[PDB]
Amino acid sequence: MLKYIIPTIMLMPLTWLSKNNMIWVNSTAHSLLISFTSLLLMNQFGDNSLNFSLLFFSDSLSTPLLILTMWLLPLMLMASQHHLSKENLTRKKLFITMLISLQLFLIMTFTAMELILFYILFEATLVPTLIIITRWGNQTERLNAGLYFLFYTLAGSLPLLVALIYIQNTVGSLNFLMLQYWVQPVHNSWSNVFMWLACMMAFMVKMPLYGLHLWLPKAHVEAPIAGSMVLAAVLLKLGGYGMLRITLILNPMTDFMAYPFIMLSLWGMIMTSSICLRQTDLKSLIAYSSVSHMALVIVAILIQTPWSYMGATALMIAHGLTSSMLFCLANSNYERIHSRTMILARGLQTLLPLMATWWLLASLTNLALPPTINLIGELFVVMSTFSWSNITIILMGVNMVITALYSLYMLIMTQRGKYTYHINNISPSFTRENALMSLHILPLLLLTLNPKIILGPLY
Amino acid sequence: GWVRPDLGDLSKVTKVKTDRPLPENPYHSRARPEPNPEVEGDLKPARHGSRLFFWTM
Numbered sequence: 001m002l003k004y005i006i007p008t009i010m011l012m013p014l015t016w017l018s019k020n021n022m023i024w025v026n027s028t029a030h031s032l033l034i035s036f037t038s039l040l041l042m043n044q045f046g047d048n049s050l051n052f053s054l055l056f057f058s059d060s061l062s063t064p065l066l067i068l069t070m071w072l073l074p075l076m077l078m079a080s081q082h083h084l085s086k087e088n089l090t091r092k093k094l095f096i097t098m099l100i101s102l103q104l105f106l107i108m109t110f111t112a113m114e115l116i117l118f119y120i121l122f123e124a125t126l127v128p129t130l131i132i133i134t135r136w137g138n139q140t141e142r143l144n145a146g147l148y149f150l151f152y153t154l155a156g157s158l159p160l161l162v163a164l165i166y167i168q169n170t171v172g173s174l175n176f177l178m179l180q181y182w183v184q185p186v187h188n189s190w191s192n193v194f195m196w197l198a199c200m201m202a203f204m205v206k207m208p209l210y211g212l213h214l215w216l217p218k219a220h221v222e223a224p225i226a227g228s229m230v231l232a233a234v235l236l237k238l239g240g241y242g243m244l245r246i247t248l249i250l251n252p253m254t255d256f257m258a259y260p261f262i263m264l265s266l267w268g269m270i271m272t273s274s275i276c277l278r279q280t281d282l283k284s285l286i287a288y289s290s291v292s293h294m295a296l297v298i299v300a301i302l303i304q305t306p307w308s309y310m311g312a313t314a315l316m317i318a319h320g321l322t323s324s325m326l327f328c329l330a331n332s333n334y335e336r337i338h339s340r341t342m343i344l345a346r347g348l349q350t351l352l353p354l355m356a357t358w359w360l361l362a363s364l365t366n367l368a369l370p371p372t373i374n375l376i377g378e379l380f381v382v383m384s385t386f387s388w389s390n391i392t393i394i395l396m397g398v399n400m401v402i403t404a405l406y407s408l409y410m411l412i413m414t415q416r417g418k419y420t421y422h423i424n425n426i427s428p429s430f431t432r433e434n435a436l437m438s439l440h441i442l443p444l445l446l447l448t449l450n451p452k453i454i455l456g457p458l459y
Numbered sequence: 460g461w462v463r464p465d466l467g468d469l470s471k472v473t474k475v476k477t478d479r480p481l482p483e484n485p486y487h488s489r490a491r492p493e494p495n496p497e498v499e500g501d502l503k504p505a506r507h508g509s510r511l512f513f514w515t516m
């Protein structure tokens with residue numbers, strides 16, 4: 001992985017040694033070049049994962065997440081450089097450094113072969129993320145949002161640290177390849193019930209699981225746009241990726257420990273979808289949309305079927321691009337009217353016709369219009385949960401209906417109707433804003449032509 | 460014919476011949492516990508280094 005780790009680090013010298021007026025051009029261009037080379041990770045085999053060294057390996061699960069992560073860095077740079085224009089030069093370079101360091105921790109997190117190396121990097125992403133939210137957020141509440149984000153995560157992570165170290169003691173290793181062959185079954189006992197909880201609660205909080213999700217709408221509403229992009233696109237998927245790996249050693253206890261969390265997700269997804277119908281804040285609506293989508297991922301990981309794992313892998317990638325696009329779309333409105341109130345600026349399709357096309361495409365992927373990968377992921381999950389229990393189609397069906405209602409409600413309220421009279425600073429969409437939107441939707445729609453590369457190890 | 464010893468004579472350490480056998484275990488000592496088995500051999504590099512978690516050295 002050094003062909004990706006090292007050039008990612010070299011982005012830091014590049015940013016700091018760039019001319020004062022070229023920090024965005026240089027960092028954006030060279031982070032796109034790194035994104036290009038990440039496609040070499042798709043040298044995947046039918047039987048064996050791609051194991052580079054004792055430290056790093058890349059299978060079909062981590063490969064698409066790595067490519068999503070490295071694609072997101074250039075997009076985040078494009079999305080931030082407007083609202084950071086008045087920033088002090090050094091504080092602009094420190095902002096970019098926080099994003100580069102986040103990418104560094106992320107690509108190492110997704111390829112760590114040892115679970116305790118995964119834990120440290122998994123935890124290391126907190127610091128740059130927290131600093132972005134609290135230093136470069138705009139509102140007073142960004143400070144409270146930082147604390148909720150920090151302490152929700154740590155409340156779960158610290159038990160996970162104890163469980164992993166206990167697992168290394170008893171099994172002798174935490175290398176994920178070794179665990180595949182040395183895994184022993186988990187037999188019922190209160191001791192194992194809490195080993196199971198410690199291994200899964202840290203990841204449940206990151207997804208987040210319904211009930212434990214309150215940190216997420218706070219963080220999104222306060223984060224800067226680049227922070228919201230990485231939060232929704234990648235950092236949520238650290239929970240999913242971690243769960244997909246650790247469940248290997250939790251069998252067969254996962255048979256009955258899953259029930260309380262499937263119930264929370266199946267019911268929680270209807271509850272958070274319905275919350276979206278009455279949200280007044282556009283960013284908060286998108287945040288609650290992520291909770292509903294990630295509920296499906298939690299259910300799919302817990303029912304442990306080949307179809308559900310394929311569906312979860314596609315959902316994580318599809319959600320990553322769609323939710324990131326939606327936050328970017330809402331941000332472009334915010335940079336004009338400087339409010340997140342959804343009902344404030346209406347009828348924008350009249351004033352920004354092409355940006356209204358992006359709003360349409362983003363909404364269609366969010367409601368999972370076939371054959372988007374949003375629909376492929378969501379459909380595969382629904383097929384597998386139906387076999388788990390037929391009655392789940394009722395809850396899946398209702399969520400699909402409510403998901404369409406709030407997706408098109410967001411489209412209709414902001415883009416259609418009459419424009420707000422007194423709002424007269426809706427300038428024409430910039431090239432930067434249109435290119436940012438297209439760099440989200442075009443790769444998302446292109447992946448429909450070749451969806452096998454985002455279906456994960458069980459394809 | 461008794462001669463008085465000189466100053467320093469009676470404080471001399473003298474040798475005495477005896478036909479009594481020297482005691483073997485005057486303290487009545489028990490047998491001393493055996494020492495811990497000595498660790499000997501050629502110091503080789505640690506196998507695969509520290510082996511602490513993920514570290515490869």
Ligand SMILES: CCCCCCCCCCCCCCCCCC(=O)OC[C@H](COP(=O)(O)OCCN)OC(=O)CCCCCCCCCCCCCCCCC
Pocket residue numbers: 055104120121124513514515516
């Ligand atoms: C620190 C870089 C990562 C930054 C992100 C932070 C990640 C989380 C940090 C927590 C610790 C996790 C570190 C994980 C790696 C440690 C395990 C390891 O790397 O193996 C032992 C390592 C030898 O590595 P080895 O596999 O043998 O490869 C040899 C290549 N010549 O031997 C070692 O342990 C030392 C290696 C430490 C890794 C950094 C040092 C690498 C050498 C580059 C130093 C810079 C040299 C250039 C100087 C520029 C001056 C301007």
Ligand SMILES: CCCCCCCCCCCCO[C@@H]1O[C@H](CO)[C@@H](O[C@H]2O[C@H](CO)[C@@H](O)[C@H](O)[C@H]2O)[C@H](O)[C@H]1O
Pocket residue numbers: 188189190193257260
């Ligand atoms: C979000 C929170 C989710 C909470 C989920 C709760 C799951 C509850 C699981 C309960 C079953 C635990 O597993 C159960 O534990 C006891 C440990 O005493 C084991 O049984 C053992 O202790 C009991 C004492 O009660 C003895 O009678 C028994 O002889 C002994 O073997 C059982 O063999 C095992 O079946």
